[PDB]
Amino acid sequence: GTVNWSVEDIVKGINSNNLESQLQATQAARKLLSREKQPPIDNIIRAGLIPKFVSFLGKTDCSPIQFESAWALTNIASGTSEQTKAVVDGGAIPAFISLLASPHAHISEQAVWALGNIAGDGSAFRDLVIKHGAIDPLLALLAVPDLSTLACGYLRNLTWTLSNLCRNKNPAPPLDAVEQILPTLVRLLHHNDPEVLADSCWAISYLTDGPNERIEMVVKKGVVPQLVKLLGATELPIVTPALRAIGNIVTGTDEQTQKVIDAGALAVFPSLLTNPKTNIQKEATWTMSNITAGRQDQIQQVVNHGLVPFLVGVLSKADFKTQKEAAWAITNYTSGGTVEQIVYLVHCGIIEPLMNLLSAKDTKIIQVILDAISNIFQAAEKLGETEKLSIMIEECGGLDKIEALQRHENESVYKASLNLIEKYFS
Amino acid sequence: CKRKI
Amino acid sequence: KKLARE
């Protein structure tokens, strides 16, 4: 019936003066644009059909052509930025926002989906959707006593579209828009659907990816305990955004970091730092590195939770990018730690894996490691045990590596290595 | 110090 | 991100 129409037949039907013919052709276009293999988005655009689809969004008396045109435009807007721009350029944003209040649930949901694709293009279209007034009608669809009474697919689409309104930087979303969205977002973050939870975590991870004022807006809403719970979920699609959000939060103030620790996050890192997914392991070590850049009492919590052996392990064996984050966690630890905390680091076996990574070609890790070695020596100077440390480094072959680094072409590298050689190995 | 992104 | 329907 409406399967495998040509663009020229679609155009003929839409250009007819006959609404039912227009409805049939619009469905035929929807089916073309919903095929998995090379949907002819550009051909449909070149045919000039977008302004017609947008007009059809306003045909209140023919809800089927509203639905069919909304679906067609959603699939166009799901493509490249240029294809999304063509939808926006046709006036689709205010048309779709007016459809959010449709009494036909499947039409409102399609409008939600379409606006998610448009906002998801980038910050400019995101802010344009907001300026057209999308947030109030979107939040009204979620203003129910219990989210469980909404259809699962509907709720997932609403969550995903709100997450795109939280996404992207330069600029970040408007502060008033974030404040308007957050209470509903925290409600979704407590829902039981895994997909709603994943996308709510993603939204929170976007809102915390920025200056400490942005982090504070989110933390103030009390979401950190829920995030830590989701950090232990079995679903990798939940753990990943949950961990990103927690990681972002601990880039903030020591007080914001302390709420993560107070919520019990460190007890999850034995698993995260051994997680079979390389990206989870890397992000967990990056998170640890910002925690060890904190206060001495926060370093002490890292010790109390038994996480230094886990950092020794990642340094010993892990994807190189994870090992790089581990070197940062160690150097930050040695930078702000007490003499006793730094000593404990050596007792846990940090020296040998740290020395073995000086053989890495990456120049930055070498500078990070050498700075950690210096801080560890300085802690040993205060106990008069520099010699015993020097012997550890020689026995595991670190002295040979530091000596060879005096020939390194980078300036700061061959500078720091020489200082250690002359200061402690002479 | 803290390392964003 | 962007998602196509069916």
Numbering used by the authors:
A (entry chain B): 72 to 497
B (entry chain A): 255 to 259
C (entry chain F): 58 to 63
What do the study authors state?
The henipavirus matrix protein (M), which drives viral assembly and budding of the virion, also performs non-structural functions as a type I interferon antagonist. Based on the NiV and HeV M X-ray crystal structures and cell-based assays, M possesses a putative monopartite nuclear localization signal (NLS) (residues 82KRKKIR87; NLS1 HeV), positioned on an exposed flexible loop and typical of how many NLSs bind importin alpha (IMPα), and a putative bipartite NLS (244RR-10X-KRK258; NLS2 HeV), positioned within an α-helix that is far less typical. In this pathway, proteins generally display a classical NLS consisting of either one (monopartite) or two (bipartite) clusters of basic residues that bind with high affinity to the acidic pockets on the concave surface of the adaptor protein IMPα. These binding sites on IMPα are denoted the major site, located within armadillo repeat motifs (ARMS) 2–4, and the minor site, located within ARMS 7–8.
A structure was resolved at 2.1 Å, with the complex of HeV M NLS2 bound to IMPα2 in the P21212 space group (the same space group and crystal form as M NLS1:IMPα2). Here, we found the NLS2 peptide bound in the minor binding site of IMPα2 (ARMS 6–8). Whilst density at the major site of IMPα2 was present, it did not correspond to the HeV M NLS2 sequence, and subsequent analysis of IMPα2 crystals by mass spec analysis revealed this to be an E. coli contaminant (30s ribosomal protein) corresponding to KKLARE. Five residues of the HeV M NLS2 could be reliably modelled at the minor site, with the main chain and side chains well resolved, and revealing 255CKRKI259 at the interface, with K256, R257, and K258 bound at the P1′–P3′ sites, respectively. The interaction was mediated through eight hydrogen bonds, 2 salt bridges, 68 non-bonded contacts, and a buried surface area of 361.1 Å2 (see also Table 1 for a full collection of data collection and refinement statistics). Specifically, M residues 255CKRKI259 interact with only the IMPα minor binding site. Here, M NLS2 R257 and K258 residues occupy P2′ and P3′ forming 4 H-bonds and 3 H-bonds, respectively, and this binding conformation has been observed in other cargo binding the minor site. An additional notable feature of the M NLS2-IMPα interaction detailed in this study was that the NLS2 peptide 244RRAGKYYSVEYCKRK258 did not bind 244RR245 residues that have been reported to be part of a functional bipartite NLS. Our structure revealed that the CKRK258 residues bound at the minor site, precluding the ability of NLS2 to bind as a bipartite since NLS cargo bind IMPα in an antiparallel manner. We also note that the NLS2 region undergoes a conformational change upon binding IMPα, since region 252–261 is helical in the full-length context, but linear in our structure.
